[PDB]
Assembly symmetry: D2
Homo-oligomer: 257 residues x 4
């Protein structure tokens, strides 16, 4: 699917991004660059994938200059840039849950900084590099959420940030189609990662107990591989005419708990 | 191979998008692909070309629920299962006034609604019932939709209403059949060169670009039946094991209808 | 007064939401309200109660396009105008197996689709033709829809499909009739205590609260037919002069269907 | 009865444009008191004096400063004895030669647009809700001004598009969380209203609007006015909308696509 492509995975040191980097390489990616802020964790992932197929770059995506450097380093080292997986994202793990009435505006600022400013800087810098290189069939994919299209009972800062990511995806797909660049998102429900266990979901039983009643599809558990497979489809020529689309991977979510 | 060992029915498989999907499903390793359709000899030609040991042709007017029952049951006992139902058959009216609201021909409305909604509903029902009987694991039902399932049209109002209805069927069936591990999704392509769009006036890739090009964000690629079949194959495979109730839009970033 | 001097037709006005809309339209100053229904005894009682100088009954099965045309003609001729068409009549199956996909009764599907999609389309068409013919300024066409026009259902799959189709009609009619200054919108209420919901087993406010209370964000108020009528009167008035193609949802923040 | 009889309303950004007209229309619909919160002191006191000092007051309030929002909300509730309507209407767009396209996104201008439109709006919803809960307000209403660009992408002003998407996420979440208190939260999404903001974008006259947007607008024979937007807001703020929450009320004349 991805033979000969060069991909960057922000947040690739952990969770969904880690699995996505592994799966992109299994799909024949020429090179996968993990861009994260967890240097030793990230280097670990890179060697696990294979030090000759995967590299790590320290990159705080909220700092546009660090994004530009990571993008430039990637294109120079590997001679191209075909896939930007804008995946890094954070939540506030606030004791009072970031409800509207208890909204911690300082914690709100942190979430919006990473999830909207960082994602926007990543889309911008990746687009600029693909255009400069004349990349053909380039793909930019943002990790979203069902909370990009419906409200939350908690984590209001996160909900607003993912709504904003969807607006960015829609706008970028409109503006970058002229260059043949496709911009899409993938919105998974609950994946066991370090993020979801900070919310109190550590085991598949925790997931089913929290969400199963609200999930239409029975008899299958959502894995990080599932999310990576959706993203590899979007990045591949199997999706050559798909842009501006939010690919939802949620088992028919009826509502949040 | 993503469809290895699966048994697929493709309605409307004698022509256009359905024909390509049947070929592409077989190329992705489907054990058997059954074309259900009403163009008897165009369809036998296709199953012939795909490989008479991989592909059969069944006469099936999808509006008739007993013919859908029969086609589904024939497929399952012949090949020992049913894993994928690609509910793709569908029509438009091709009317002098264009089926604007002002000039809606109620009789032609009835014909479009009969195939596109009653027939699609019959296929989803009969395919689902058989999957549950056989105990199919990870079954997939996929309906061909349209950007006109989520937006209004300037013309072909009956077709627009029918595709809106198909989307409601997909959403409802996903919530009801998830208990059986059956996933239900749709694929919504924009303009594919088929006999249907030829009846509309689009014969050549240059016609498509002249009618839809300025309304499409993505430049440098034309949509093909293969693209739609690849979207469906993805949805039918384990690559989409947790995707249900979803409308997979393949429109190049359609800004608006012309 | 919001609707001062306007002539309105309310289909399904003999009962439930339509009856309350007819009364509320008159309270907002409508010059004439015409109730179009198939329950003549009930409908004549509503018309007489609103006021025989202000309100008339016409027998009209909206699934028969000729009866619709006749009712619209009679309204414009009797009252010299047509400003508001509230296409509100609709039905459900009330089947013992709930019209799930697995147990979908196609003949009952046909009945629901006939009233809710074919009939609604004929009403939109015939009202639009008449307002265009009269030169109506700022005419309004409103269809009663449902949260099930935008999400799937666990039951009543035929009704879900039909209300999706109604939204496709509203969107299409909005884009085609705006050239004439005609606005087309829908209103989508959740559970109102009417003969329709009584037939689904909801007879009392406690029944509604038990079925839907914990799926509804908004507490302290129960949806009434008057709430729905006020939404329709807003959309029908100059308070909504630039609103078209819109589905006005009146559901209390519905988290999910039961 | 007047649609807003007896209600106390706050209108942020009420010194100008849509918010000024909303303040006038709310008073016209019988609001007991309208408080204009803005950062244009002389303009805002003009509006308040014009509506009538007995029924309208002005407060200086930078909505991106949560403390000033809380202070304006407390002053309203203490002065007038209640808080029934919060119309979170203040917002900005960037001054950008490059249009804030993705390719030329000025990140520091993006920051400012997000700070006012998302951080400020969130603070306004929070502080208004906290007060209505404290007061035991019955049938309270919080309305945010949104845009078609809350639900569709834009060719330009990408920062603004993301900010309005985020506002809709706030409206949806607040609706879900505040319904327990009887508080309804909705948005109103107008297309092109002639204001100082759209003049800055190059739309100064009705002909400008028609030339830029007429062929993309289904509804003919009428042009969107600020009064139309205010009437939609007044509806949502009233008992005519007693069961409407979490809803985006679109006022765009059937917009077929963005320019
Ligand atoms: N896990 C879920 O269930 C779930 C569901 C829906 C959406 N998501 C989203 O998927 C993305 C990945 O989430 P995850 O579950 O793998 O969480 P995770 O915490 O396991 O991984 C996130 C990684 O992003 C990195 N990160 C944080 N800030 C960064 C920054 N400024 N610059 C660069 N990297 C940064 C982190 O170091 C981390 O390695 C996130 O956008 C999340 O919002 C997750
Ligand atoms: N061509 C496009 O650009 C386009 C765009 C959007 C959606 N679609 C939809 O994709 C589906 C296939 O369209 P197509 O372009 O391949 O058109 P097509 O006419 O070339 O193929 C349709 C086939 O379905 C068969 N058919 C019609 N009624 C039938 C019935 N009752 N029972 C069984 N078969 C019946 C027809 O014989 C035909 O072989 C349709 O549902 C169409 O609405 C097509
Ligand atoms: N909770 C609710 O009541 C609810 C919720 C959502 C949507 N709706 C929709 O609101 C509309 C009215 O529903 P209601 O609850 O008032 O039901 P109701 O049964 O109380 O009233 C419906 C009236 O429509 C008339 N009707 C049926 N078929 C007709 C036909 N062919 N021609 C003319 N009239 C016909 C009926 O005789 C009846 O008087 C319907 O479209 C319904 O789908 C109702
Ligand atoms: N005019 C349009 O076409 C249009 C369309 C859709 C949405 N909107 C939105 O409507 C809102 C009002 O826009 P408008 O056209 O009336 O513009 P406007 O500039 O005429 O009025 C906005 C007023 O908000 C005040 N404002 C800005 N930042 C503020 C802050 N931090 N604190 C307090 N007040 C502040 C401003 O001084 C100004 O008086 C905005 O949210 C805009 O996004 C406008």
């Amino acid at each position: 699917k991805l033979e000969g492509k060069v991909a960057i995975v922000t947040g690739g040191a952990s969770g969904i991004g880690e699995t996505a980097a592994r799966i992109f390489a299994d799909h024949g990616a020429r090179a996968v660059v993990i861009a994260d802020i967890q240097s030793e964790l990230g280097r670990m992932v890179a060697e696990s994938i294979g030090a000759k197929r995967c590299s790590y770059v320290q990159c705080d995506i909220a700092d546009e200059e660090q994004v530009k450097s990571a993008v430039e380093w990637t294109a120079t080292t590997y001679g191209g840039l075909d896939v930007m997986f804008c995946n890094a994202g954070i939540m506030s793990h606030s004791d009072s849950g970031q409800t509207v009435m208890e909204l911690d505006m300082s914690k709100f600022d942190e979430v919006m900084r990473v999830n909207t400013r960082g994602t926007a800087a990543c889309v911008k810098q990746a687009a600029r590099k693909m255009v400069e290189l004349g990349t053909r069939g380039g793909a930019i994919i943002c990790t979203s959420s069902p909370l990009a299209t419906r409200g939350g009972h908690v984590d209001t800062d996160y909900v607003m940030s993912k709504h904003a990511v969807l607006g960015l995806v829609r706008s970028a797909s409109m503006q970058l189609g002229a260059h043949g660049i496709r911009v899409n998102s993938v919105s998974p429900m609950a994946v066991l990662t370090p993020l979801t266990r900070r919310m109190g979901l550590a085991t598949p039983a925790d997931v089913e107990n929290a969400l199963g009643r609200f999930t239409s599809l029975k008899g299958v558990a959502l894995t990080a591989e599932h999310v990576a497979e959706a993203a590899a489809f979007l990045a591949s020529d199997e999706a050559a005419f798909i842009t501006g689309h939010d690919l939802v991977v949620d088992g028919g979510l009826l509502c949040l708990p």
